[PDB]
Design a protein around this ligand. Structure first.
Ligand code: HEM
Length: 152
């Protein structure tokens, strides 16, 4: 369970993400797909993309990043009270998309890496620990929903 102070560190770096969520999403997705190419495999709409240049030029990838980051931001803004938001996300990701929890950890690592690089002013050590705590809680709760939905 996060403290209010930890939530505020999460939300103050998210405020900078929101200056340009599309650009942040491109960086995060490119980082994810380069570090863990198997994640890109899971995304039939994007898996043809071969290079970073193609990824930066893909309007679908950009839109994908905006949708994903905006849904994560809505979860973070609930400061742990995110049961309603996780229900549909867990169901689609466990049952249709078939995204293992480990791939959500990979995505979490890409988020942290990009915030660290782009936002040293709001992603110092304490802020990065708060973000990690928030993403671990997200992953914990969505893993519990995965199990309830019949996926392990
Ligand atoms: C914080 C983590 C994530 C969030 C908040 C998130 C959010 C979303 C949202 C809002 C959608 C659209 C509605 C839906 O289908 O549920 C979506 C679709 C999708 N997501 Fe995720 N996602 C996350 C992680 C991932 C990861 C790591 C992968 C793959 C490695 C993934 C694969 C997909 C796919 C394949 C779709 C459908 C894309 C299509 O329409 O062609 N998601 N995600």
């Amino acid at each position: 369970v996060l403290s209010e102070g930890e939530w505020q560190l999460v939300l103050h770096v998210w405020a900078k993400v929101e200056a340009d969520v599309a650009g942040h999403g491109q960086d995060i997705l490119i980082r994810l797909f380069k570090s863990h190419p198997e994640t890109l495999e899971k995304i039939d709409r994007l898996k043809h993309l071969k290079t970073e240049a193609e990824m930066k030029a893909s309007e679908d990838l950009k839109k994908f990043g905006v949708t994903g980051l905006t849904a994560l931001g809505a979860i973070l803004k609930k400061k742990g009270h995110h049961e309603a938001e996780l229900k549909p996300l867990a169901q689609s990701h466990a049952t249709k998309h078939k995204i293992p929890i480990k791939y959500l950890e990979f995505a979490s690592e890409a988020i942290i890496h990009v915030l660290h690089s782009r936002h040293p002013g709001d992603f110092g050590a304490d802020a990065q620990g708060a973000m990690n705590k928030a993403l671990e809680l997200f992953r914990k709760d969505i893993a519990a929903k995965y199990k309830e939905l019949g996926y392990q």
